Amino acid sequence: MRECISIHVGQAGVQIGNACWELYCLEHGIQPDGQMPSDKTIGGGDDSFNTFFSETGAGKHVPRAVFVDLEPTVIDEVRTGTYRQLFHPEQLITGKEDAANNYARGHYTIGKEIIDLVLDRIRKLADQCTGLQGFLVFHSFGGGTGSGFTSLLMERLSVDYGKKSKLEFSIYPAPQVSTAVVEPYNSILTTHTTLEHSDCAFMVDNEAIYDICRRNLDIERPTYTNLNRLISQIVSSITASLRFDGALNVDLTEFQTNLVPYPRIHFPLATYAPVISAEKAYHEQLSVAEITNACFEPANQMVKCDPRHGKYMACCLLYRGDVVPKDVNAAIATIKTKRSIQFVDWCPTGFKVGINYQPPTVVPGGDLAKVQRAVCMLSNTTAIAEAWARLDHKFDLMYAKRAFVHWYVGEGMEEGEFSEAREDMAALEKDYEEVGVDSV
Amino acid sequence: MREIVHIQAGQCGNQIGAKFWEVISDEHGIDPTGSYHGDSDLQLERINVYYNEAAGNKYVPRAILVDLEPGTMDSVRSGPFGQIFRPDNFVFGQSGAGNNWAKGHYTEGAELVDSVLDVVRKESESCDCLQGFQLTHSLGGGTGSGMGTLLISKIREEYPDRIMNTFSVVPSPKVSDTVVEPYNATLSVHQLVENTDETYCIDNEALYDICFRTLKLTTPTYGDLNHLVSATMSGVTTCLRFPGQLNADLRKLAVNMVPFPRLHFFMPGFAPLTSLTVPELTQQMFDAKNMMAACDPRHGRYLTVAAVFRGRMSMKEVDEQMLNVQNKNSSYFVEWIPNNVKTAVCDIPPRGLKMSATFIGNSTAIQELFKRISEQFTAMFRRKAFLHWYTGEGMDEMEFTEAESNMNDLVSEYQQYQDATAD
Amino acid sequence: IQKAIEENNNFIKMAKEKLAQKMESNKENREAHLAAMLERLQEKDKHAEEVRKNKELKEEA
Ligand SMILES: Nc1nc2c(ncn2[C@@H]2O[C@H](COP(=O)(O)OP(=O)(O)OP(=O)(O)O)[C@@H](O)[C@H]2O)c(=O)[nH]1
Ligand SMILES: Nc1nc2c(ncn2[C@@H]2O[C@H](COP(=O)(O)OP(=O)(O)OP(=O)(O)O)[C@@H](O)[C@H]2O)c(=O)[nH]1
Ligand SMILES: [Ca+2]
Ligand SMILES: [Ca+2]
Ligand SMILES: [Cl-]
Ligand SMILES: [Mg+2]
Ligand SMILES: [Mg+2]
């Protein structure tokens, strides 16, 4: 009970959804045919994993997920892939023409033609829920679908489910694997339009994941598969509290209370450790203190920024595996006396800790090593605004010449929406400056 | 399921078009009869983009062949892969246009255009999701230039929300002796500036200089020139024909390449040109000597660029080298378009080469090309020479002035953003 | 609890309205951008109709 509906929008969302659900199945002992031998409650149950999987009379466990893309080639691989049987066909929704990296096409022109069907299929999942908690929306900032249609969906979900919670996993654009020159435009437009409709958004910088793969896994040129398999690990750590339950397990919502002081300030910085190859892990067990140390090395963050040059508003540690409170408290004591951790004056400096005993799983043939214990730190730091600034600057360089703007106006958008969105980002950057100033 | 409809008009259009189909047919494993005999399943994954599927597992190019003269229609019919085309897709005139833009655009072509639109419409009516059209034609002749720009205008009337692409061959004294070619070219650009989304400027001046100086071919033939054009066209379409994330859609490419609607005239490039290491391909590909448009990129600035590498190669090396040429040539990329250089790698090597590279550039140095045509044009308009050829077809001489001014406006606009700064 | 309900409804109210205001304004603009483009091409055909008429007038001289 208190189920979560995942929504995967665009190529990035869908492919990351493939990585997450594959990982979920392995963590829960669910087979590609949806069967789970260990589940003795056939066709139902109120187990912890039932927050993410529904059950059929035939014993199949079905992700509470919807995949949506405006073109079929990406979802088609799901329809024919290893886990094709996991999803009921109606869970996989495809258009025929993509948004061509144009926010307007995803939000208006092409999006309007499929939005009703998507909501109807999302409604068919909510009707199977006894106490639906909220939504997890996986999408990219950069794509036309991931930015424009997502905004439309978030807008329409706030209407059909009032203030029921909606969480984002957003792919922040990075030049190394970027696809378009207009992504700064689409990133600003979608951030402006979803800001009022998202309760918490976890940003993932592809450059950060790109660097981590090359440095920590000695992958010379990471692919989307490399990045997604790492991203799934982080997503798993965040959602593990919802899918497993235990004596030290802390619900995501409880962390969420500490991470959002003001509604607009809902962008936590995620850091994950250990990311280590199986060749290096061999005969080198990482202790609780070692992985906790890594949470404060910026090289391990999901978003490139410097917490050292900002102020903390919250600090959460989500351990999974062989971890006990003592080792955690010991490590934190060392960290607090040895690292730069300065909080705003208006909030407590404690660290909120949660532990899941189920240990991390690795997908066969992956690059990560299986470890006894892992940790994901969620921190509300003002440094996250650096990601807005970098993007806002790139937006400003092009918009000053109205470069590429005609492609959006041609689809029905007005220059006003560009300046309206940029102004919102200006406030957001000024909001992050305000929260970090001392009191008088 | 994202189909492109191909059109070739005039001699030049029909001949480079036929050669284009020869090359890609080989790359996909399609023999002159339309039967597949290939080694890889990736050849067929996106074959639909340019081919229809037929009874008996045969593949038919989605191409229509147009000309105001029947000579070329027999020539195409009897050449290699001649019988692969759909016989109803030959729309041929009887008389020709005598290298007169007005005849192709206003009178003789107007009689034949309707019959052309019928075959365009039917190829379009059987498309799962049509993305747009690509036209091959010269801008110096009469049929391809005038009628082609007319056909573009009529197609955009019936498919206004679809992409219009052209491979437009720009005329040069070094190849064609005809004298009024500068008139036809300027009139064509006047139309292409308004009704096309992407124009690949295939410059005969550059193709000649390449054949003579680099390939060391004294007295080059049209076959020598087209050999270069087919290599370029195969490279531009590699992203469309094979599964590659980057520019896989005509408009997704246009969105990434066209920062302002009127400045959609690209410099194509190819490497290697001979008859190789990743560093050498890249800096060769960025050389003035390797451009298919007679322009020096170092006399301007780059708005947007697309590099396409084909073959088996170290992508870490490709990334390193593409990132290196930008730091070393940072003055020639506009600073107000961040990350304006994109790179695609296609695992498929081309024919006869282990590694190749195709270059697509939207550079403000393209003005050097348009200034040349404006120079050839004005030299005649100041003497009102040969105008009777056009006034006889109903045209008014101030329509020439409009074309001239609109092209001179286009040049100034390229200079407008070449001199622009950030702060 | 009345106030909590009141503010949830206004959020749904203003959300749907603003959305409906954009989807309509968006349809107006794209329609007008196409309408103007088709207007232009039709003006080229009219200019094409006259030119062909201007040719037959000079054949009678
Ligand atoms: N981490 C990760 N990011 C991706 C992946 N695919 C796309 N992205 C991000 O998304 C951007 C490209 O847009 P896409 O998401 O592929 O396109 P889309 O969302 O389907 O929207 P359209 O294709 O334009 O219709 C890139 O710049 C990336 O930052 C992926 O597989 N993994
Ligand atoms: N590179 C290349 N250019 C060609 C070839 N054939 C024709 N051209 C170019 O085509 C232009 C002349 O126009 P045509 O090829 O005769 O096409 P057209 O419009 O049908 O001409 P007409 O029917 O006689 O009015 C010149 O600029 C030539 O350079 C060719 O085989 N290779
Ligand atoms: Ca059960
Ligand atoms: Ca010749
Ligand atoms: Cl379009
Ligand atoms: Mg897509
Ligand atoms: Mg001819």
- Are A81 and A166 part of one and the same domain? yes
Q: Number of CB pairs < 8 Å for A and C?
A: 41
- Are B266 and B232 part of one and the same domain? no
- Give the whole-angstrom CA distance, residue C47 versus residue C58: 17
Report CB contact under 8 Å: A398, B246: no
- Give the whole-angstrom CA distance, residue B400 versus residue B416: 24
Q: Assess contact for A98 and B252: CB atoms under 8 A.
A: yes
- Are B314 and B385 part of one and the same domain? no
Question: Residue with structure tokens 């068919």?
Answer: A124
CB atoms within 10 A of CB B259: 26
- Are B185 and B308 part of one and the same domain? no
CB atoms within 10 A of CB A343: 17
The secondary structure of A305-342 as a DSSP string is --GGGS-EEEEEEEEEES--HHHHHHHHHHHHTTS---
- Give the whole-angstrom CA distance, residue A285 versus residue A290: 9
DSSP type of residue A65? E
Tell me which residue has its CA closest to atom 5 in ligand 2. B12
- Are A281 and A251 part of one and the same domain? no
- Are A430 and A298 part of one and the same domain? no
How far CA C38 is from CA of A121, B155, B159, C41, in Å, comes to: 38, 11, 10, 5
- Are A356 and A320 part of one and the same domain? yes
- The three-class DSSP label of residue A150 is helix
- Cβ-Cβ contacts under 8 Å for A260 (sequence gap 6 or more): A199, A200, A266, A380
Nearest-5° Cα angle at B134, B130 to B135 = 140
Chain B residues 295-314 with CB within 8 Å of chain A: 304
Expressed as residue numbers, the domain containing B311 is: 260-365
Domain boundary among B365, B382, B402: B365
- Cβ-Cβ contacts under 8 Å for A243 (sequence gap 6 or more): A24, A27, A28, A48, A49, A51, A52
- Are A174 and A248 part of one and the same domain? yes
In the chain, the amino acid numbered C24 is: E
In the chain, the amino acid numbered B92 is: F
- Are A326 and A339 part of one and the same domain? yes
Tokens for B213, please give them: 């100086």
- Are B138 and B235 part of one and the same domain? yes
Q: How large is the angle between the packed helices B222-236 and B10-28, nearest 10 degrees?
A: 50
Return the sign of the alpha-carbon dihedral for residues B4, B10, B16, B17: positive
- Are A282 and A237 part of one and the same domain? no
- Are A181 and A302 part of one and the same domain? no
Tell me which residue has its CA closest to atom 12 in ligand 1. A143
The CATH number assigned to the domain holding B164 equals 3.40.50.1440
Where do breaks (C to N over 2.5 Å) occur in chain C, by preceding residue number?
none
Tokens for A426, please give them: 């200006």
Nearest-5° Cα angle at B150, B144 to B154 = 135
Q: Assess contact for B16 and B229: CB atoms under 8 A.
A: yes
- Are A180 and A263 part of one and the same domain? yes
Helix ranges (H only) for A217-282 are 224-243, 252-259, 278-281
Domain count of chain A?
3
- Give the whole-angstrom CA distance, residue A191 versus residue A385: 13
Radius of gyration of chain B (CA): 21
Closest alpha carbon to B184 in B212, B142, B246, B137: B142
DSSP type of residue C50? H
How far CA C30 is from CA of A108, B244, C19, C33, C43, in Å, comes to: 10, 31, 17, 5, 20
The CATH number assigned to the domain holding B412 equals 1.10.287.600
Tokens for B374, please give them: 């404006």
Chain B residues 206-265 with CB within 8 Å of chain A: 245-246, 249, 251-252, 254-256, 258-261
Q: Assess contact for B304 and B343: CB atoms under 8 A.
A: no
Tokens for A404, please give them: 């590429």
Domain boundary among A334, A366, A383: A383
Cis peptide before A222 (omega within 30 of 0): no
- Are A274 and A379 part of one and the same domain? yes
Tokens for A109, please give them: 């022109």
* A166 contacts in chain C (CB < 8 Å): none
Domain boundary among B259, B281, B310: B259
- Are B282 and B162 part of one and the same domain? no
Tokens for A286, please give them: 């990482």
Consecutive H or E run containing A25 = helix A10-28
Q: How far is the CA of B255 from the centre of ligand 6 (A)?
A: 14
- Give the whole-angstrom CA distance, residue B116 versus residue B10: 13
Q: Convert B129-161 to b/e letters by CB count within 10 Å (16 or more is b).
A: ebbbbbbbbbbbbbbbbbbbbbbbbbbbbebee
Q: Is A404 in the pocket of ligand 1 (CB under 6 A)?
A: no
Method: X-ray
Chain A residues 36-95 with CB within 8 Å of chain B: 72
Catalytic entry in A77, A97, A196, A254: A254
Domain boundary among A383, A403, A427: A383
The CATH number assigned to the domain holding A338 equals 3.30.1330.20
Helix ranges (H only) for A53-134 are 73-80, 103-104, 115-126
Chain B residue with minimum CA distance to A223: B315
- Are B195 and B277 part of one and the same domain? no
Tokens for A236, please give them: 């798993």
SS3 labels along B378-417: HHHHCCCCCCHHHHCCCCCHHHHHHHHHHHHHHHHHHHHH
- Give the whole-angstrom CA distance, residue A191 versus residue A141: 8
Tokens for A274, please give them: 């250990």
Expressed as residue numbers, the domain containing A20 is: 1-268
- Are B221 and B312 part of one and the same domain? no
Closest alpha carbon to B254 in A71, A33, A101, A37: A101
Tokens for A291, please give them: 């992985």
- Are B105 and B213 part of one and the same domain? yes
Nearest-5° Cα angle at A318, A317 to A321 = 130
- Are B116 and B152 part of one and the same domain? yes
Report CB contact under 8 Å: C19, A197: no
Closest alpha carbon to A379 in A222, A227, A271, A264: A271
DSSP type of residue A60? B
- Give the whole-angstrom CA distance, residue A167 versus residue A173: 19
How far CA A164 is from CA of A136, B379, C10, in Å, comes to: 11, 72, 15
How far CA A440 is from CA of A345, A434, A436, in Å, comes to: 10, 13, 13
- The three-class DSSP label of residue A251 is coil
- Are B395 and B359 part of one and the same domain? no
Report CB contact under 8 Å: B394, C41: no
- Are A80 and A219 part of one and the same domain? yes
**From the DSSP assignment, how many helices (H) and strands (E) are in chain A?**
16, 12
B127 in A contact zone (CB under 8 Å): no
Which residues are found with C-beta within 5 Å of the ion, ligand 3? Answer: A 39, 41, 45, 55
- The three-class DSSP label of residue A217 is coil
- Cβ-Cβ contacts under 8 Å for C52 (sequence gap 6 or more): B106, B107, B110, B394
- Catalytic residue flag (residue A27): no
Q: Assess contact for A355 and A320: CB atoms under 8 A.
A: yes
* Residue A363 backbone phi and psi in degrees, to 5: -75, 140
The secondary structure of A170-216 as a DSSP string is EEE--TTT---S-HHHHHHHHHHHHGGG-SEEEEEEHHHHHHHHHHH
- The three-class DSSP label of residue A114 is coil
Closest alpha carbon to A407 in A103, A69, A96, A71: A103
- Cβ-Cβ contacts under 8 Å for A177 (sequence gap 6 or more): A206, A210, A222, A224, A227
- Give the whole-angstrom CA distance, residue B385 versus residue B390: 11
Q: Assess contact for B332 and B206: CB atoms under 8 A.
A: no
- Give the whole-angstrom CA distance, residue A163 versus residue A199: 9
How far CA A213 is from CA of A15, A224, A290, A295, B21, in Å, comes to: 17, 11, 19, 16, 42
- The three-class DSSP label of residue A145 is helix
B129 in A contact zone (CB under 8 Å): yes
Report CB contact under 8 Å: B106, C52: yes
Q: How far is the CA of A141 from the centre of ligand 1 (A)?
A: 8
- Are B25 and B159 part of one and the same domain? yes
Q: In Å, what resolution does this model reach? A: 2.8
Question: Regarding beta strands B355-363 and B265-271, do their DSSP bridges make them parallel or antiparallel, or are they unpaired?
Answer: antiparallel
Phi-psi region of A283 (alpha: psi -120 to 50; beta: other; left: phi over 0): left
Counting ligands in written order, the one closest to the CA of B15 is 2
Question: Residue with structure tokens 């969906």?
Answer: A153
Question: Regarding beta strands A134-140 and A4-9, do their DSSP bridges make them parallel or antiparallel, or are they unpaired?
Answer: parallel
Question: Residue with structure tokens 């593949």?
Answer: B59
DSSP type of residue A285? P
Q: Is A19 in the pocket of ligand 1 (CB under 6 A)?
A: no
Return the sign of the alpha-carbon dihedral for residues A257, A263, A265, A268: positive
- Are B246 and B394 part of one and the same domain? no
Which of C54, C56, C57, C59 would best serve as a mutation to test chain B binding (most B beta carbons within 10 A)?
Answer: C54
In the chain, the amino acid numbered B326 is: Q
Consecutive H or E run containing C21 = helix C2-58
- Give the whole-angstrom CA distance, residue C61 versus residue B303: 53
Helix ranges (H only) for A347-409 are 385-399, 405-409
- Cβ-Cβ contacts under 8 Å for C26 (sequence gap 6 or more): A104, A108, A411, A412, A413
Nearest-5° Cα angle at B106, B104 to B111 = 75
Query: Any binding-site annotation on B226?
Result: yes
Return the sign of the alpha-carbon dihedral for residues C33, C35, C38, C44: negative
CA distance C28 to chain B (A): 16
Closest alpha carbon to B29 in B63, B58, B6: B58
Residues in chain B, how many? 423
- The three-class DSSP label of residue A293 is helix
- Give the whole-angstrom CA distance, residue B199 versus residue A279: 52
* C34 contacts in chain B (CB < 8 Å): 160-161
- Give the whole-angstrom CA distance, residue B182 versus residue A220: 52
Which residues are found with C-beta within 5 Å of the ion, ligand 7? Answer: B 11, 69
Closest alpha carbon to B123 in B77, B167, B78, B64: B64
Q: Assess contact for B361 and B267: CB atoms under 8 A.
A: yes
Radius of gyration of chain A (CA): 21
The CATH number assigned to the domain holding A435 equals 1.10.287.600
Domain count of chain B?
3
Q: Assess contact for A71 and A9: CB atoms under 8 A.
A: no
Q: Number of CB pairs < 8 Å for B and C?
A: 33
Q: Is A212 in the pocket of ligand 1 (CB under 6 A)?
A: no
Domain boundary among B207, B231, B259: B259
Q: Assess contact for A70 and A99: CB atoms under 8 A.
A: yes
In the chain, the amino acid numbered B79 is: G
* Residue B250 backbone phi and psi in degrees, to 5: -60, -45
- Are A340 and A394 part of one and the same domain? no
- Give the whole-angstrom CA distance, residue B112 versus residue B372: 32
HSE-CB of A190 using CA atoms within 13 angstroms = 37
SS3 labels along chain B: CEEEEEEEEHHHHHHHHHHHHHHHHHHHCECCCCEECCCCCHHHHCHHHCEEEECCCEEEECEEEEECCCHHHHHHHHCCCHHHCCHHHEEECCCCCCCCHHHHHCCHHHHHHHHHHHHHHHHHHCCCEEEEEEEEEECCCCHHHHHHHHHHHHHHHHCCCCEEEEEEEECCCCCCCCCCHHHHHHHHHHHHHHHCCEEEEEEHHHHHHHHHHHCCCCCCCHHHHHHHHHHHHHHHCHHHHCCCCCCCCHHHHHHHHCCCCCCCEEEEEEECCCCCCHHHHHHHHCCHHHECCCCCHHHCCEEEEEEEEEECCCHHHHHHHHHHHHHHCHHHECCCCCCCEEEEEECCCCCCCCEEEEEEEEEHHHHHHHHHHHHHHHHHHCCCCCCHHHHCCCCCHHHHHHHHHHHHHHHHHHHHHHCCCCC
Cis peptide before B272 (omega within 30 of 0): yes
Q: Convert B184-205 to b/e letters by CB count within 10 Å (16 or more is b).
A: bbbbbbbbbbbbbbbbbbbbbb
- Give the whole-angstrom CA distance, residue A340 versus residue B301: 45
